[PDB]
Structure formats: C-alpha cells, structure tokens
Amino acid sequence: TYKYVNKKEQESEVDMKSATDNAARILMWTELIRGLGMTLSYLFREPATINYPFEKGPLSPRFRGEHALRRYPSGEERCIACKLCEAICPAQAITIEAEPRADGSRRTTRYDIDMTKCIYCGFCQEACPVDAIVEGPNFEFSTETHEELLYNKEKLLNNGDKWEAEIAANIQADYLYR
Amino acid sequence: RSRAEYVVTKLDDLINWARRSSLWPMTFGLACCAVEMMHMAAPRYDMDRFGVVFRASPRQADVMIVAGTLTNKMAPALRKVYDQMPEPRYVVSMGSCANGGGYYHYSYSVVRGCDRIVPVDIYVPGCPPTAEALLYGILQLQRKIKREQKLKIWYRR
Amino acid sequence: KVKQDMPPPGGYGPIDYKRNLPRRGLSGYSMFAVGIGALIFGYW
Amino acid sequence: MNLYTVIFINILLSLTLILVAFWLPQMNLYSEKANPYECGFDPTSSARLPFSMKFFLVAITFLLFDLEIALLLPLPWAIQTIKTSTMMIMAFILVTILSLGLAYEWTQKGLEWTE
Amino acid sequence: MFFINILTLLVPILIAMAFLTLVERKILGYMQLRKGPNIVGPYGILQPFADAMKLFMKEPMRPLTTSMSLFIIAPTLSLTLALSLWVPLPMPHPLINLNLGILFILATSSLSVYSILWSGWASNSKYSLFGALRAVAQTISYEVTMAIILLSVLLMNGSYSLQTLITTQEHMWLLLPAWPMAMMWFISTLAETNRAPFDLTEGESELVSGFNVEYAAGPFALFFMAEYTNIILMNALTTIIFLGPLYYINLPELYSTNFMMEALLLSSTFLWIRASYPRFRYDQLMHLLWKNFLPLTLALCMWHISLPIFTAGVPPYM
Numbered sequence: 077t078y079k080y081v082n083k084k085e086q087e088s089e090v091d092m093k094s095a096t097d098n099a100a101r102i103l104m105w106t107e108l109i110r111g112l113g114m115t116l117s118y119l120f121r122e123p124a125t126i127n128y129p130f131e132k133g134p135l136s137p138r139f140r141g142e143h144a145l146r147r148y149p150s151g152e153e154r155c156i157a158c159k160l161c162e163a164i165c166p167a168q169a170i171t172i173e174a175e176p177r178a179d180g181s182r183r184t185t186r187y188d189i190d191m192t193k194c195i196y197c198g199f200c201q202e203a204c205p206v207d208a209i210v211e212g213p214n215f216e217f218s219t220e221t222h223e224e225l226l227y228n229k230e231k232l233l234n235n236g237d238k239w240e241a242e243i244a245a246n247i248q249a250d251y252l253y254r
Numbered sequence: 255r256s257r258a259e260y261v262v263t264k265l266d267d268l269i270n271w272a273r274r275s276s277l278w279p280m281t282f283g284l285a286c287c288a289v290e291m292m293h294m295a296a297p298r299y300d301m302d303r304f305g306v307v308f309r310a311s312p313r314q315a316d317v318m319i320v321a322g323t324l325t326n327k328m329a330p331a332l333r334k335v336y337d338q339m340p341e342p343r344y345v346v347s348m349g350s351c352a353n354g355g356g357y358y359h360y361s362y363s364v365v366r367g368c369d370r371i372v373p374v375d376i377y378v379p380g381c382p383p384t385a386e387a388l389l390y391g392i393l394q395l396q397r398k399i400k401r402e403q404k405l406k407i408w409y410r411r
Numbered sequence: 412k413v414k415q416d417m418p419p420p421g422g423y424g425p426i427d428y429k430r431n432l433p434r435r436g437l438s439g440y441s442m443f444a445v446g447i448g449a450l451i452f453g454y455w
Numbered sequence: 456m457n458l459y460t461v462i463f464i465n466i467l468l469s470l471t472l473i474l475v476a477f478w479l480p481q482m483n484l485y486s487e488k489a490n491p492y493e494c495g496f497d498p499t500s501s502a503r504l505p506f507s508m509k510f511f512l513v514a515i516t517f518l519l520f521d522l523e524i525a526l527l528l529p530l531p532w533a534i535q536t537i538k539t540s541t542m543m544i545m546a547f548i549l550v551t552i553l554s555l556g557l558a559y560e561w562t563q564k565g566l567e568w569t570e
Numbered sequence: 571m572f573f574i575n576i577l578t579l580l581v582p583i584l585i586a587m588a589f590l591t592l593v594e595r596k597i598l599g600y601m602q603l604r605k606g607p608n609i610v611g612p613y614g615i616l617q618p619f620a621d622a623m624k625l626f627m628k629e630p631m632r633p634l635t636t637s638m639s640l641f642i643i644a645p646t647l648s649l650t651l652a653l654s655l656w657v658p659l660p661m662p663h664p665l666i667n668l669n670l671g672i673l674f675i676l677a678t679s680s681l682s683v684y685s686i687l688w689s690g691w692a693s694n695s696k697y698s699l700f701g702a703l704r705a706v707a708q709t710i711s712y713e714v715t716m717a718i719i720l721l722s723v724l725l726m727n728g729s730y731s732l733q734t735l736i737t738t739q740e741h742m743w744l745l746l747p748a749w750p751m752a753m754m755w756f757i758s759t760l761a762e763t764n765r766a767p768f769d770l771t772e773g774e775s776e777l778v779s780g781f782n783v784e785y786a787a788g789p790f791a792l793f794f795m796a797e798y799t800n801i802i803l804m805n806a807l808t809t810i811i812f813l814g815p816l817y818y819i820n821l822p823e824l825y826s827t828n829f830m831m832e833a834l835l836l837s838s839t840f841l842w843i844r845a846s847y848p849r850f851r852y853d854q855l856m857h858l859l860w861k862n863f864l865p866l867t868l869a870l871c872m873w874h875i876s877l878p879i880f881t882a883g884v885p886p887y888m
C-alpha cells in the first residue's frame with residue numbers, strides 16, 4: 077500500500093470566498109504567523125535542560141564505561157589469563173602475558189588496555205568466563221595526556237577496587253539477562 | 255610576594271575567567287563522534303548555557319574539537335584550520351579514533367591519533383564518548399584554562 | 412514462571428500518527444474588513 | 456558644532472577600540488596562519504579574478520529608480536503649493552510612468568537573473 | 571554639559587547592545603527548549619562582558635592577501651555609523667536636532683553598506699567576496715522601496731523632522747492609517763540590518779561567515795557591536811514613526827519610558843523571527859522587494875499623495 081504526499085491536484089473552480097481567503101493568506105502572512113505561534117508556545121514551556129554536573133543524564137545497569145578488573149569476595153583476582161577477551165577484542169586493544177604465580181596460580185603479569193584503541197563494545201566482558209574484566213559505569217575519566225589512557229594491570233585493578241560496590245550492584249541487576 | 259605580584263595574579267584570574275566563560279568551538283566534526291557533539295548542544299545539555307558557541311570560521315574560534323576519525327587525506331586540512339585559529343587556541347581530542355586511531359588504528363589510511371598533527375589539551379575517551387562525557391571534558395578544559403599563569407610568569411621573567 | 416518484557420494484556424492504547432494541524436483563523440473577509448476599517452478610521 | 460563634536464567622539468571611540476585590539480593581545484605571526492581561508496584547502500586562484508554579476512540589469516535599473524525617488528522627495532514641500540491640481544497631476548504622472556517602466560522591464564524578463 | 575550628554579547617550583546604548591546579545595541567546599534558547607546562558611553571572615548577565623573581554627584579548631588577523639587600509643577602516647566605519655544614527659533620535663528630545671533628520675538616517679544607513687563591501691573586498695578571500703556581493707544585491711533589493719515607504723508616511727507628517735512625528739501622532743499611532751506601509755517598512759528593516767530571514771551577507775550555512783570570515787578578535791567584535799546597535803536603532807525608529815509613544819510636555823520621561831517598552835518589544839520580535847523561519851535565497855529577496863513591495867509601495871505613494879488633497883488634510887509645513 078502507498079499514499080501520495082503531494083498529489084492534491086483535484087483542480088476546482090474558485091469562489092470569491094476562497095479567492096479572498098487565498099488573498100488574505102498571501103497578503104497578511106497568515107501561515108508565517110502560525111510559525112511564530114509555535115515558537116512562542118515553546119518560549120513558555122519548561123526547558124528540557126538539566127543542571128549538569130549537579131544533575132546527570134539517566135543511565136542503565138548495562139552501561140558500557142571505563143574498564144576494571146574484579147576480584148572474588150576473598151580478594152583473589154578473578155582473571156585466570158585465559159585470553160578470551162584478548163582474542164575477541166575487535167580493536168586488539170588488550171595485551172596479556174601470564175605465568176604461574178608463586179603459589180602456582182594461573183595469573184597474568186601483563187594486562188593492558190589501550191583505551192584509545194578500545195571501542196567500548198563490551199565484547200571482552202561477554203567473553204570473560206569468570207566476570208573478571210568488565211566495563212564499569214564511569215564515563216568521566218577524560219585526561220590531559222594520551223599516555224594516561226594506556227591502562228596497565230595496576231590501573232585496571234585499582235579501577236576494580238575503586239568501583240566494585242557499584243559494579244557488583246549493576247551485575248546483580250542484569251546478570252539474569254545474560 | 256608583593257602588591258605588584260598580587261595585582262598581576264588577580265589580572266591572570268580575570269583574563270583566564272574571560273576565556274573560560276566564552277569558549278567558541280569551530281564548526282568542525284569528522285564522523286560519528288560529531289553526532290554526540292550535536293547532542294551536547296541539544297536542549298538537555300545546552301552547551302550554550304556555559305558560554306560555548308559554535309562559529310564556522312577558524313578566525314572566530316578558540317577550540318577545535320576533533321570529533322571523529324582523522325584520515326591521511328584529511329590531515330593537512332585539519333592542520334590548516336588549526337593554524338588559522340588565532341591564539342590563544344585549544345584542542346580537544348574526542349573519541350578513540352581521534353585519541354589514537356581506535357577501531358581503525360591499523361589502517362593504511364588513518365592517522366593514529368590526531369596528536370600526531372596538532373597539540374591536544376584534553377583527551378575524551380569513548381567510542382563515542384557520551385554527550386555528558388564530552389561536556390565533562392569541556393569543563394576540564396575550562397579548569398585547565400583557570401590554571402594558566404601567563405601574566406605571573408611574564409612578571410617573574 | 413517465565414517473566415519477560417511483554418505488552419500488557421489487551422495491548423497498548425492506540426497511537427496517533429496521522430498529521431493533525433488545526434484549522435484556525437478568521438475568514439478572508441473579516442481580516443480585510445478589520446484592516447480596511449483601521450485605515451478609514453486613521454484617514455479620518 | 457555639536458554634530459561635529461559627537462561624530463568625532465564616535466570616530467574617536469571606534470579608533471581607540473581598534474588600537475587596543477591590535478596592541479593588547481599576544482601575537483604569533485607565521486605564514487600558514489595568515490594564508491587565506493578556504494575550508495582547509497588552498498585556494499586554486501586569486502579572489503581578485505572576475506566574479507560574474509547575474510543581476511547586472513537590475514543593478515543599473517536601480518540607478519534610474521534612485522533618481523526617480525530623488526524627484527519624489529520634494530513632495531512634502533510641494534503639497535504646500537496653491538497649485539494643488541498641477542502638483543497632483545505631476546506627481547501622479549511621475550509615479551505612473553515609473554510603474555510603466557517597471558512593468559515593461561518585468562514583462563521583458565529584465566528582473567530575471569541571467570543564467 | 572554637552573559632553574556629559576554624549577556619554578549618557580553612547581554608554582547606555584552600548585550597554586543595551588551588549589545585553590541584547592544576552593537576550594537574543596536566552597530568547598532563542600527558550601524557544602528551542604533550552605535555557606541559554608545562566609552560569610556566567612546571575613542568569614548569564616556577565617556573559618556579554620566575558621565575550622567582549624575574550625575577543626579583545628585575542629590575536630587579530632593580519633592575512634597576507636589582504637589590502638590592509640580598507641581592512642582596518644571597514645569595522646571602524648561600521649561602529650562609527652551605528653553610533654551616529656542615534657544622535658538625532660528624539661526620545662522625545664534629540665541630542666542633535668536636525669531639520670532633515672529622516673534624510674540623515676537614510677544617508678548614514680546607506681553609507682553603512684560600504685563597511686560590508688570594503689571588508690569583504692579588502693579581505694581578498696573568496697567567501698568574503700561572496701558576502702560583499704550579496705550586500706550589493708541586498709541594498710539594491712530593499713533601498714528601492716524603503717525611501718518611498720518613508721515618503722508616503724511623511725506626507726502625513728509634513729516634514730523630514732523626526733521630532734515632528736511626535737506631534738503628528740499626538741492622538742493616534744501612525745500605524746492605524748499606515749499599517750500596510752508599516753508592514754513593508756518592518757520587512758525592510760530586517761533586510762537593512764542583515765537579519766534573518768535575510769541574513770545573507772554572513773549566511774553561515776552557505777558562506778561560512780561571508781564578509782567577515784577573515785576577521786578575528788577585536789576587529790570582529792566591532793562588526794558585531796555595530797549590527798546589534800543597528801537592530802535597536804531601526805526598531806526605535808519604527809517605534810517613533812508608527813507607534814508614537816505618549817507625549818506630554820510636562821512629563822517628557824513618560825515618552826522615554828513608553829518609547830523603551832515599545833522599542834524593547836520590537837527588538838524581541840527580531841529575535842523571535844530569527845528563531846522561526848528559514849533563510850531566503852538572495853535572488854528571492856530581490857524578487858520579494860521588486861515584484862511585491864515595489865508595486866504596492868508605488869500605488870500607496872500615489873494614494874498618500876491623493877489622500878491629503880481630497881480630504882483637505884495637508885499637514886502644516888511648520
């Protein structure tokens with residue numbers, strides 16, 4: 077099914093009434109007045125502006141923000157250096173090295189995320205089998221240098237220790253959809 | 255310190271405040287990151303309420319917001335319009351592409367970070383950064399300008 | 412039991428989508444009559 | 456004297472702002488900054504080459520119509536005349552022929568811009 | 571004392587101009603569901619001063635292809651002429667009382683176009699030349715009818731003296747007998763001030779910035795100061811010609827208060843119009859003026875020659 081957007085060409089004769097209405101519309105700018113009415117009506121509407129940074133835009137638990145590395149409730153790292161996140165990373169933003177820890181544990185010695193390569197796609201956190209790497213809720217981490225956005229393992233673990241309380245609560249809210 | 259140093263310091267504050275309060279970015283956007291820049295100008299965030307107004311002429315602009323991917327074919331043109339901004343001028347790198355090449359870092363046709371072409375004051379991460387994340391970076395540029403000490407340094411020369 | 416995001420039972424209320432611009436304003440005669448009356452009065 | 460005084464002050468104020476604007480700011484002159492703007496690419500020619508005027512006929516018609524209004528601007532003094540009928544006919548004829556001139560140029564497509 | 575009077579005209583007019591930049595940005599904002607400036611000062615009332623201080627602390631352009639004398643002269647001429655247009659304005663008593671004050675306005679306003687023409691030419695860049703040639707077309711469009719519109723109105727005034735318009739309207743707005751000319755006059759002042767929907771000499775979507783594209787810093791500010799001063803001037807002129815503020819010989823300040831209110835309102839409709847309409851094409855502005863306004867303006871000039879004769883309503887010479 078289709079409709080015409082501009083086929084109103086049922087040409088008809090013109091009375092004095094309609095000719096005068098057409099004349100009034102041209103000479104008195106009536107449709108231009110309707111435009112002013114619309115902008116006037118917005119003048120008296122409450123604006124949609126929020127008072128950033130005292131107010132914030134709404135977000136959801138799924139929001140993909142700054143990365144972090146998480147722990148188990150004991151403090152043990154969750155990451156076991158499987159490299160699934162590194163393999164899937166569409167930007168090759170992740171670089172990992174690992175070796176047996178002093179207690180024999182399978183753990184990383186390098187876990188880097190180039191935040192200026194990363195596309196914030198969340199594929200790493202889907203691929204992680206142990207919920208180790210996550211994108212947290214933080215989006216306010218702009219820096220004054222490029223180098224500050226090349227995160228190493230210490231930075232990423234500090235983000236985890238910094239943001240776990242909110243990260244844990246967001247995972248509790250969404251994990252049944254995953 | 256002295257009363258001449260105090261007066262110089264208060265003048266630094268005044269000129270700094272003026273440039274903080276009237277930052278005019280160039281109408282300049284490269285790719286998807288520019289869409290979020292539009293959303294910072296849109297009513298919810300209304301950048302104009304902070305004093306931020308786009309002007310199309312580089313001669314009338316203070317900030318360049320590199321909002322998107324910078325290709326090799328585009329690089330000379332971006333350098334040209336940066337050079338044609340009168341000073342003092344600032345650069346905000348917005349998004350992974352501008353920050354360091356992002357998803358296209360390994361391409362034959364892409365500049366791996368606009369900071370190979372122009373100096374950068376603020377790096378805003380994200381792909382794209384949200385309109386709010388960009389606004390945060392703009393407010394971080396303002397605080398950077400608040401820290402400028404050009405008149406104090408002139409006095410001590 | 413399974414809990415998903417579903418429409419309410421019975422569906423949602425109907426949604427307007429067709430163009431709706433009001434018809435408003437005076438006839439052509441009334442506008443010209445008011446405008447010509449202002450002129451004649453001013454001339455006087 | 457008063458009109459001279461205020462206009463000089465107006466000139467004086469404008470020139471002072473120009474001097475402040477050119478001597479207060481820090482400068483940094485280099486060639487790429489001062490080259491002409493053209494959206495980030497270099498111009499391919501001078502801006503001093505001929506720029507075609509498609510409304511050139513309207514432009515020289517405007518010269519004649521501007522002397523027609525010069526003939527109309529004495530009308531406030533002319534309506535004070537005892538010879539009201541003569542003045543009225545002269546003004547009516549003047550406006551009518553100017554209308555006929557505009558009507559002719561309109562029907563000759565003289566107000567259409569050239570392509 | 572005459573020097574004090576110059577200050578009490580120029581300084582308040584320059585502050586009124588500065589705050590019109592604020593009012594425009596807030597009125598446009600609210601019509602766009604935004605707020606506009608509300609941080610730099612209370613409710614944004616220091617935002618104009620910040621923009622002014624920023625511009626004059628900025629490096630001013632010295633482009634290489636530029637012919638420098640006209641480049642400097644044009645913005646200087648712009649602000650001079652904008653301020654000069656105010657000296658004969660009777661509010662209700664003018665600073666300078668001119669016998670042909672209306673003709674002074676036309677001549678001064680007509681010289682104002684040369685600041686646009688010379689700046690665009692002197693800059694010696696393509697987008698600035700485009701803006702200059704649009705100014706040529708703009709003046710050809712509206713100047714053809716603006717003086718005839720004024721002519722017809724002043725056949726009820728009886729002179730070119732601005733102060734006489736106050737007496738002419740002692741019992742009635744000139745709007746009432748002249749509303750068709752008032753409508754055409756109002757559109758002409760929009761074009762005369764290069765305001766939307768006729769903001770063609772700058773037109774930023776097409777020419778980037780048109781005539782002033784090569785201008786930076788304080789020289790750029792002069793063009794902006796001159797444009798916002800002229801908007802107030804042309805609406806104040808529209809107020810005195812068609813909306814005769816109430817005059818009482820023993821209450822002059824009543825005229826000034828009423829004049830300001832109507833002038834403020836007419837300036838607001840300029841900002842309201844900018845927020846509402848798209849831009850004309852600059853060939854379409856010429857056709858609007860020469861094929862619609864000009865026929866009616868000529869007919870109405872003939873009608874307003876005819877009227878005082880057949881009603882025996884010729885105004886006094888003095």
Ligand SMILES: CCCCCCCCCCCCO[C@@H]1O[C@H](CO)[C@@H](O[C@H]2O[C@H](CO)[C@@H](O)[C@H](O)[C@H]2O)[C@H](O)[C@H]1O
Nearest residue numbers: 341477478479480481482483484485486487488629632
């Ligand atoms: C009887 C003759 C008397 C002796 C005359 C001597 C004249 C010598 C003038 C030297 C130049 C002074 O003129 C000024 O120089 C400075 C720095 O030097 C330059 O100014 C600007 O450009 C350069 C570009 O790199 C920057 O380094 C400088 O900081 C900046 O201010 C300009 O060139 C000019 O603004």
Ligand SMILES: CCCCCCCCCCCCO[C@@H]1O[C@H](CO)[C@@H](O[C@H]2O[C@H](CO)[C@@H](O)[C@H](O)[C@H]2O)[C@H](O)[C@H]1O
Nearest residue numbers: 537538539540541542543544545547548549551552879
């Ligand atoms: C080809 C171009 C055509 C366009 C030009 C047409 C011009 C023709 C004009 C015809 C109208 C003349 O209109 C004429 O006006 C004069 C006054 O002005 C009237 O004159 C009347 O009033 C005057 C005072 O003014 C008395 O002195 C006179 O005795 C009396 O007749 C005439 O009664 C009327 O006929």
Ligand code: SF4
Nearest residue numbers: 165194195197198200
């Ligand atoms: S969010 Fe995407 S691009 Fe960024 S590190 Fe994870 S998988 Fe790589």
Ligand code: SF4
Nearest residue numbers: 155156158159161204
């Ligand atoms: S973060 Fe997860 S996916 Fe990546 S190496 Fe560690 S355990 Fe494997």
Ligand code: SF4
Nearest residue numbers: 286287349350351382
């Ligand atoms: S960083 Fe992401 S959103 Fe921004 S331009 Fe590059 S791909 Fe698009």
